[PDB]
Ligand binder design. Structure first.
Ligand code: SF4
Length: 191
């Protein structure tokens, strides 16, 4: 009747046509997401940076390159999971997306998660965090590492955004993130 591929494409087409928030006026290309539509684990960030915007792909910038390594160091191949963000359009001067802008785009993420139906989601960053606590304010630093019960029994593991490890290069910091990723993997349901 219908395939996951087709539904994601519909999401994709509606995004390219979206003008729901101010961010549509700035971006060069929308960044929907990429990966395995059958992964049991999804990674979600904040939004498009300069490279993402140019390639229309997620996490291709320096932060993305770093994320690739964290995944590799967690026994994970990019091609095996799915990667996306809370907002699809790049804000001017890469400023942080406004909560309003965040609220307007969210329905897309929801559909994506709906289509993939994963066992666990990793929230990279505070923005990714807000989305899973209903926009509410929460300190990424205080909650990182603690599993959150989300819809359909799915678990969300919040952790730091790769962008942070670009800034602070301490090994302790990298170890914590990896620890959090391992944590999420433990929630993937055994075969
Ligand atoms: S950021 Fe999202 S809600 Fe705003 S114009 Fe882009 S696709 Fe639409």
């Amino acid at each position: 009747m219908y395939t996951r591929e087709e539904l994601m494409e519909i999401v994709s087409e509606r995004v390219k046509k979206c003008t729901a928030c101010p961010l549509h006026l700035n971006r060069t290309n929308v960044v929907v997401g990429e990966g395995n539509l059958d992964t049991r684990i999804v990674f979600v960030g904040e939004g498009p940076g300069e490279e993402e915007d140019k390639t229309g792909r997620p996490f291709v910038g320096r932060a993305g390159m770093l994320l690739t390594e964290l995944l590799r160091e967690s026994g994970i191949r990019r091609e095996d999971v799915y990667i996306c963000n809370v907002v699809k359009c790049r804000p001017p001067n890469n400023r942080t997306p406004t909560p309003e802008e965040q609220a307007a785009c969210g329905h897309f993420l929801l559909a994506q998660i709906e289509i993939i139906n994963p066992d666990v989601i990793v929230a990279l960053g505070a923005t990714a965090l807000s989305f899973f606590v209903d926009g509410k304010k929460v300190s990424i630093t205080k909650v990182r590492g603690n599993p959150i019960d989300w819809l359909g029994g799915k678990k969300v593991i919040p952790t730091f955004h790769p962008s942070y490890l670009l800034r602070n290069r301490s090994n302790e910091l990298r170890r914590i993130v990896l620890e959090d990723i391992e944590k999420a993997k433990s929630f993937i349901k055994k075969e």
